[PDB]
């Protein structure tokens, strides 16, 4: 019944209206947790991973002049900017954005979806078309970015090698 | 945890008569839980622990080939 | 140890974050 896994029954709490629906939930986490939370969590983890994948792609032929002389490897970079006191400013600013975008209701118990489908945080300054298949395009790019990011950092931990150097001609 | 979960699913909930089968539980617990565990454990001591005590490495890698006594069975 | 960073992440998690989450979860559960 599930489009993605026909041998499994359709996840009941999922619906085709939701963006990026293939009826893919073999563990049935949509039974364990509220779909609206998972949906919000999916798009957010995506949007954060999207920016994380770009961060690694830009800071490799560049590294902004004023922060020059810092390693572009994941763990060394983390250790440098925490020591610097830059990551603590970013933490509080992300903490600020989280409270502002969700307007106080931040808890799984508190967070509500009155006149907003999951993902709609009211951020569309250019005013591009939202209510269409554009949500499915965000999801697909977000899902790819989450696996993408995971592929970058694990490559960075394995052989201490750059994202773009990996796709030249190298095997262990 | 899988077994625990399985046995409170409707088809796998054992009946009250199953739980009060004294003779069966005693046979299995004596011969199986105590008896066979002690037999299997003897296997460990003879195959692994006693060799290890004599500086002979026996593990999963070689235990098929390495006889715990020269005279075999 | 090999992954000598792990205690710096997991001890706060098990010691601060998870107990607060569990207290919060149980509070709501026993007050509704």
């Amino acid at each position: 019944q599930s489009p993605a896994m026909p041998f499994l029954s359709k996840p009941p709490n999922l619906s085709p209206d939701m963006p990026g629906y293939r009826g893919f939930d073999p563990l049935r986490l949509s039974d364990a947790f509220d779909v609206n939370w998972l949906l919000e969590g999916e798009v957010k983890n995506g949007r954060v991973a999207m920016l994380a994948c770009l961060h690694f792609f830009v800071t490799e032929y560049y590294q902004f002049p004023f922060y020059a002389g810092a390693p572009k490897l994941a763990a060394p970079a983390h250790d440098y900017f925490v020591k610097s006191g830059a990551m603590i400013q970013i933490l509080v600013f992300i903490g600020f954005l989280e409270m502002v975008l969700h307007r106080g209701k931040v808890l799984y118990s508190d967070m509500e979806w009155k006149g907003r489908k999951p993902g709609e945080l009211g951020f569309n300054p250019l005013n591009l078309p939202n209510d269409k298949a554009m949500k499915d395009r965000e999801i697909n790019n977000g899902r790819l970015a989450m696996l993408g990011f995971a592929g970058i950092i694990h490559g960075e931990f394995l052989n201490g090698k750059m994202p773009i150097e990996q796709i030249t001609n190298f095997q262990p | 945890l899988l077994a625990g979960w399985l046995h409170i699913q409707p088809k796998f909930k054992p009946s009250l008569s199953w739980f009060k089968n004294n003779e069966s539980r005693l046979n299995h617990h004596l011969a199986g839980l105590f008896g066979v565990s002690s037999l299997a454990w003897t296997g460990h001591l003879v195959h692994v622990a006693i060799p290890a005590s004599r500086g002979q490495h026996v593990g999963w890698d070689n235990f098929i080939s390495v006889a715990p006594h020269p005279a075999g069975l | 140890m090999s992954a000598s960073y792990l205690p710096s992440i997991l001890v706060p998690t098990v010691g601060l974050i998870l107990p607060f989450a569990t207290m919060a979860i149980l509070f709501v559960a026993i007050e509704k």
Binding site: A32 | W5, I8 | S2, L6
Partner: peptide, 28 residues
């Protein structure tokens, strides 16, 4: 010596026990 990979393999299997534990807990 136990490698980073071995410690992380342990953590995913402990995660699996977590999943199965919650499944049992929720039903009991």
């Amino acid at each position: 010596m136990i490698t980073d990979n071995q410690v992380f393999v342990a953590l995913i299997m402990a995660l699996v026990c977590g999943y199965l534990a919650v499944k049992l807990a929720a039903q009991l």
